[PDB]
C-alpha cells in the first residue's frame, strides 16, 4: 500500500540493513579493475556505520598499502572491524605506493564492507568487499523463514 501508515515496526530489532555487493550489481571486480575505483586523499575523516545482514560476496580483498618507507597508507583496523563473513574468493594484495598521500577512499561513494560494518575507507589487512546498504523492515517471523 502507498500510505505512510503501511508497514509496522514492533521492535528496533526488526530494522534490517542489508549489504549488497557491487559484484551483485554486475560491476567488474577483478583486482586490477576494482583498484581503479580506489584512491588516496587527505582532509577526509573515515566514517564507519553498522549494518545487520549482507550478501555472500563473490570477491573480496585483503589489502596492505604503504608509502615507500614502509608506513601504511591504510588505517589500522578498529576493534569492531572483522573480516567479511562470506567471501568466495579473496584477493590478497600487499605493496607500496611511490607518491600517494592520505587514506583510501572509494570513488563511487560505495562502501568498503566488512563484518557488519560499512566504511568510507579501506582498512589495512582486513577482508572487504565493495557494496552499498539498504534499510527495510523484517519481522522475526519473516526473518526466521529466510535464514532458518
Amino acid at each position: 500500500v502507498d500510505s505512510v501508515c503501511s508497514g509496522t515496526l514492533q521492535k528496533t530489532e526488526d530494522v534490517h540493513l542489508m549489504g549488497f555487493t557491487l559484484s551483485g550489481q554486475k560491476v567488474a571486480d577483478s583486482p586490477l579493475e576494482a583498484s581503479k575505483r580506489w584512491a588516496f586523499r587527505t582532509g577526509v575523516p573515515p566514517k564507519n556505520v553498522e549494518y545487520t545482514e549482507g550478501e555472500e560476496a563473490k570477491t573480496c580483498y585483503n589489502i596492505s598499502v604503504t608509502d615507500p618507507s614502509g608506513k601504511s597508507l591504510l588505517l589500522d583496523p578498529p576493534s569492531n572491524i572483522r573480516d567479511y563473513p562470506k567471501c568466495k574468493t579473496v584477493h590478497h594484495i600487499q605493496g607500496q605506493n611511490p607518491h600517494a598521500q592520505g587514506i583510501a577512499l572509494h570513488l563511487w561513494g560505495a562502501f568498503f564492507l566488512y563484518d557488519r560494518v560499512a566504511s568510507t575507507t579501506m582498512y589495512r589487512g582486513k577482508v572487504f568487499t565493495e557494496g552499498n546498504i539498504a534499510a527495510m523492515i523484517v519481522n522475526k517471523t519473516v526473518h526466521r523463514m529466510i535464514f532458518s
Binding site: 509496522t8 549488497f20 564507519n48 555472500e56 572483522r82 563473513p85 519473516v142
Partner: protein, 147 residues
Amino acid sequence: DESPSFNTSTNISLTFSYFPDKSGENENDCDAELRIWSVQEDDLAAGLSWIPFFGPGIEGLYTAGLIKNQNNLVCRLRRLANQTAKSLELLLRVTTEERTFSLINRHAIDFLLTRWGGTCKVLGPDCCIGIEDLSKNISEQIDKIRK
C-alpha cells in the same frame, strides 16, 4: 516515504514494498539469485547457544538465507542499496564519530517521527489512527437510545 517492508506472500513467497518507480528503472542490471548471511539468532537450538562461551564463535556465527526474484524485488533491493548510498554518505559527513554509527537506531527514530512528530487530523493522510471501533461504539450508543 518510510522504511520499506519485506513481507511473506499475501515455499517462501516474498513481498517488497519498495518500487523505484516512486528514477529511470527498467529491465535488469542485477542477479536474480541473492544468497545472504545473518548472525545466528536461533533460540536455544544448542540449549546453551545464547552464552558467548558456548556460542559457535566467528567461524560458525553466520546463518544462510536465499531470496528469489519472484517480483523482481531483489533487483529492487539491489537498486535501493545503490540509491541509499548518497544520503548515507551525506549523513556520515555530518557525524564526527568515526568508530561506528547506529543507523539502525536512527531509522527506528525517524520511523516514529514521521508518524508522530506532527499532529493528527482524524481519518487523514500521513497519520495513523483507527476509528472503526470508535465509530462502531458511537453507532452502538445510538442503538442503546431505543426505548
